[PDB]
Design a protein around this ligand. Sequence first.
Ligand SMILES: [Mg+2]
Ligand SMILES: [Mg+2]
Ligand SMILES: [Mg+2]
Ligand SMILES: [Mg+2]
Ligand SMILES: [Mg+2]
Ligand SMILES: [Mg+2]
Ligand SMILES: [Mg+2]
Ligand SMILES: [Mg+2]
Ligand SMILES: [Mg+2]
Ligand SMILES: [Mg+2]
Ligand SMILES: [Mg+2]
Ligand SMILES: [Mg+2]
Ligand SMILES: [Mg+2]
Ligand SMILES: [Mg+2]
Ligand SMILES: [Mg+2]
Ligand SMILES: [Mg+2]
Ligand SMILES: [Zn+2]
Lengths: 157, 236, 144, 130
Amino acid sequence: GGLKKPKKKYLAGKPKKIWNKQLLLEELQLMGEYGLRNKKELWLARARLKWIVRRARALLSMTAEERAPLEVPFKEKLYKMGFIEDPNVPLDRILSLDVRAILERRLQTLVFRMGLAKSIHHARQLVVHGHVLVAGRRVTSPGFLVPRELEDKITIE
Amino acid sequence: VHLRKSLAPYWWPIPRKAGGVWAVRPSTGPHSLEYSLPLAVVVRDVLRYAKTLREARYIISRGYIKVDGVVRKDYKFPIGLMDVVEIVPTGEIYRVVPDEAKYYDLKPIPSSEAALKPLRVEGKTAVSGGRIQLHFHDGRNLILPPDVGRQIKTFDTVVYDLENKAIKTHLPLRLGQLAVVTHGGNIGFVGQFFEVVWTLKRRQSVVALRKGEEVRRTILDYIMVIGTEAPVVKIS
Amino acid sequence: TVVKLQSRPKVGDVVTLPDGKKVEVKNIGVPYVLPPAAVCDDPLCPWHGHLKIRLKLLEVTVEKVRMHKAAVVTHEWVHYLPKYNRYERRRRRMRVRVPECIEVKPGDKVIIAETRPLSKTIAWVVIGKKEDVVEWKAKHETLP
Amino acid sequence: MKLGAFYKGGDLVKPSGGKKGRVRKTKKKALGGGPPQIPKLGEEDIRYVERVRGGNHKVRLRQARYANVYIPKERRHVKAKILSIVSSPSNPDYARRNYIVKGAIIQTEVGKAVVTSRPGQDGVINAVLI
RNA sequence: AAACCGGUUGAUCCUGCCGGACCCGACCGCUAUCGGGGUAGGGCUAAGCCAUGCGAGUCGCGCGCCCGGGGGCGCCCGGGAGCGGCGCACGGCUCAGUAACACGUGCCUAACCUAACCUCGGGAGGGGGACACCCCCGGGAAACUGGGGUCAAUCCCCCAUAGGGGAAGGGCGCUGGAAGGCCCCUUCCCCGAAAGGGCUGGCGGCCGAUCCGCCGCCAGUCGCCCGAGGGUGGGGGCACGGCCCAUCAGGUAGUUGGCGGGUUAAAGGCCCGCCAAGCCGAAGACGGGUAGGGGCGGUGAGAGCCGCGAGCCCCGAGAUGGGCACUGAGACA
Ligand SMILES: [Mg+2]
Ligand SMILES: [Mg+2]
Ligand SMILES: [Mg+2]
Ligand SMILES: [Mg+2]
Ligand SMILES: [Mg+2]
Ligand SMILES: [Mg+2]
Ligand SMILES: [Mg+2]
Ligand SMILES: [Mg+2]
Ligand SMILES: [Mg+2]
Ligand SMILES: [Mg+2]
Ligand SMILES: [Mg+2]
Ligand SMILES: [Mg+2]
Ligand SMILES: [Mg+2]
Ligand SMILES: [Mg+2]
Ligand SMILES: [Mg+2]
Ligand SMILES: [Mg+2]
Ligand SMILES: [Zn+2]
């Protein structure tokens, strides 16, 4: 009798106790460093990180034979996205990943880190107003997670 | 009668979500509804000649498409296993052969082969005058004299001449012949019939085919003999 | 109506009752159940009549033999409960047709075959007792 | 026919003797039956062809005078005349009201005969001499 | 993130309940700029009552007639009111009834029907009739509807043959796990087909501008009838699976079974005549309560709990309540 409807994807990143002073301080630090719009963006990044880490945990829990046809492609995809720098690291090192690696892949973050903008908020304004070209096309979403191959194809108008 | 897209057969080469809520329902013809594809679906989604149902129905109504030697002007005509499809203005000839990936695919075949159909015998009946009616896998019938009907058994194959309405050749179900799986899971596999477990019901007997070292198992109902070590008609 | 035999006949032979009616022991299509040691004239019998059975058999135990040409048999199986990871032995009483040539008693283990419906509650018929079962194996042929 | 007055559908009673609710409020036309159509002993044969389910036809003997009596001791078929009904073992009311049913005993001109046909379903009285 | 926090004491360790923090669904308050994706919206409330409009047609290549333009061969084009065929039993809605062979899974019908479509084999001969639109008259407020005249059919009917059914006897043979089935032979009884119609082109003949047809043959093509199988839909049967209550313990009497029949497309206490006492129940009958079943959905680390088991798909039931029929392959619509 149940009809499926979409659910929020940042729930896995959102904490259940928001009123911790330490958690609030670290989240505020991350938000101010990367110029995020609200806590939903940070929790979405944490949800992405949680997916990656739980995939690593699941592949670790599978046997060697089952893990064999999935371990190498998994690390290859993480390397291609840019979350992991060495695609041949052991699987258990993937368990220790950090949300800052995912936050670095934002288009606004990359525009700031390439020196194309005066500040991270100015990079967000550039991406919003449409002056950032990704391989010729305007990508107007500041939260876009740029891959490694597309990282070098970022231009300004 | 309507065919909801959800109730359409799962092997049909159509999207399951993107599109309308309806699918073209085959019109009770010479196959099974769940093991056949309508002619409009073949023209629009299999050959991509028509972009809409209107264009497909126009193409069919002109008589450009021929199925098993007969022009078919009905857009809901069922198309099924081993059927010969012929396009008139282009001259292209396909056979609907079992496929590993699409489960049923139109593979081009030679013009000399286009007049033959390998039909699996599905049963025999006694009819008036003492004659024998063979019933084949696609519902086709052939009335024969009793002496020729006596030696043809169920699950045999016959290569049948569409143009002559005759039995070009008879391939009996024996161990060691080449057979193709025409149904479930292990579909499209061609191999040597090398092992049988004869259950009490003959149709549910366990059959094993071999392709070198590739051993697959099915039931006896799900295989069709296509000759000895070389298949008689081009199926791949 | 029923005649007994000093020895069990086979599938196929004809025996004439004292009435002079000849009954041919029919092949019911089950090769691993022997025909009974008696022959009846019942046209609803599967061994000596026109009754046709399907290929669905069941092992049951007889509970009550007091209806005419019928009995109450019990059907037992085991059901798995996932939440407790444990089993439960279930049972269900069934009404079946017992032919005249097959005499049964409470506690007996018999075999029932599904047929067309015969009464309001009867759609299975006693094909034979458990002692009438013979061993049967499929045909196993391979190409070297 | 298919009449709701002669419904042949399921009961509302369980085998345990208790009642059960009605799963369907209306009576299906497919489950309907018809009234008896067995012939009455009369002065001439009257037959009526009736349309039935699926467009088929059933011949009904609304009145029967002659019977196809078979003598196996002569291996011969004779079209005899029914003087009367001697008995209806299925129900004596049939013979009492002069109705002919299967298994009925009829005194035809060849003698006593058992009706071996369903006269309400076959439309003819095939009989066997005794 | 497999999490704890506050509260009973003068203080202390327990028990144990209540609250906090999270997600989802309904309604509600304050506030609200844009875009994309999605099968959201009188379900959770009365299956309560309804103004108004729309919501199943299509076919001139089945048929005659009438009207208008064109042209000479045998008609061309357009329109009208109809007869006739096919469809309207699909599709759309909703959740009262239902604790049930309803639903799900796995099997059956050797106990059955099926227009349309497919294939194989065979057949299409003789004859007859009526009713619309229409014309002349109406009647009635309207709904609806009467009489006379008159042209047709793929409209309706008879005849013949083919074929079909019942009873009985026999058989190599077929299917199939197994014949109460199929085929063959024999006997009687009974029922009993068809539209060679439309179009195209060709040929020939009859006929006349008051005609623009009719007839005989050929080919193509769409059609019609019988037999067999398939396909599709449907009817029916079986095993098992999924609610609460004992402050509900005995229930059942066509009830349980047998035998012989009627009815049905077909098995069956489906119904009927006779015969017996059987059938269900503490492994929970019967009684009451609640509820459409499933795919599925929410939540939790998980076991699990819940149904927001409304929307989307499949099956079921219903059309103000309760009944009963016509037509038809199929409805009790
Ligand atoms: Mg019943
Ligand atoms: Mg205190
Ligand atoms: Mg409502
Ligand atoms: Mg036409
Ligand atoms: Mg008109
Ligand atoms: Mg419907
Ligand atoms: Mg007609
Ligand atoms: Mg016959
Ligand atoms: Mg006639
Ligand atoms: Mg005529
Ligand atoms: Mg009966
Ligand atoms: Mg009853
Ligand atoms: Mg917990
Ligand atoms: Mg809705
Ligand atoms: Mg009513
Ligand atoms: Mg109505
Ligand atoms: Zn017996």
